[PDB]
Amino acid sequence: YENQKLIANQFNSAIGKIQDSLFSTPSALGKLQDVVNHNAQALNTLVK
Amino acid sequence: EILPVSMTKTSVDCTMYICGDSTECSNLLLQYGSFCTQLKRALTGIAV
């Protein structure tokens, strides 16, 4: 109750920074792409 | 309270193991597709 304004501003800045970090860095979602690539490699080997 | 954490990293050369520096053996193995590639990929994944 003493620092409501400051805490709200900090939370807003943090969420904005998270948005920007996700937008900029392209390797954040490495694990999902790794799973997709593993499945694709398995299928490619099977057909080849 | 003891807990295992890691395993010894190993890699195996498919061609040298299957064929002992024999040209005919390598030629015959050439018709079996990319099995050695899959084995090497699996071993590297285990190591990392």
UniProtKB/Swiss-Prot annotation, chain A:
Gene of this entry: S
Annotated region (Heptad repeat 1), positions in chain: 4-48
Functional description taken from the UniProt entry: Subunit of the fusion protein that is processed upon entry into the host cell. Mediates fusion of the virion and cellular membranes by functioning as a class I viral fusion protein. Contains a viral fusion peptide that is unmasked after S2 cleavage. This cleavage can occur at the cell membrane by host TMPRSS2 or during endocytosis by host CSTL. In either case, this triggers an extensive and irreversible conformational change that leads to fusion of the viral envelope with the cellular cytoplasmic membrane, releasing viral genomic RNA into the host cell cytoplasm.
Protein's recorded name: Spike protein S2'
Parent-protein start and end of this portion: 917 to 964 of 1273
Domain of life: Viruses
Curated annotation (Swiss-Prot), chain B:
Lineage top rank: taxon: Viruses
SS bond partners: 14-36, 19-25
Main function: Precursor of the fusion protein processed in the biosynthesis of the S protein and the formation of virus particle. Mediates fusion of the virion and cellular membranes by functioning as a class I viral fusion protein. Contains two viral fusion peptides that are unmasked after cleavage. The S2/S2' cleavage occurs during virus entry at the cell membrane by host TMPRSS2 or during endocytosis by host CSTL.
Protein name: Spike protein S2
Organism: Severe acute respiratory syndrome coronavirus 2
Shown segment, full-protein numbering: 725 to 772 of 1273
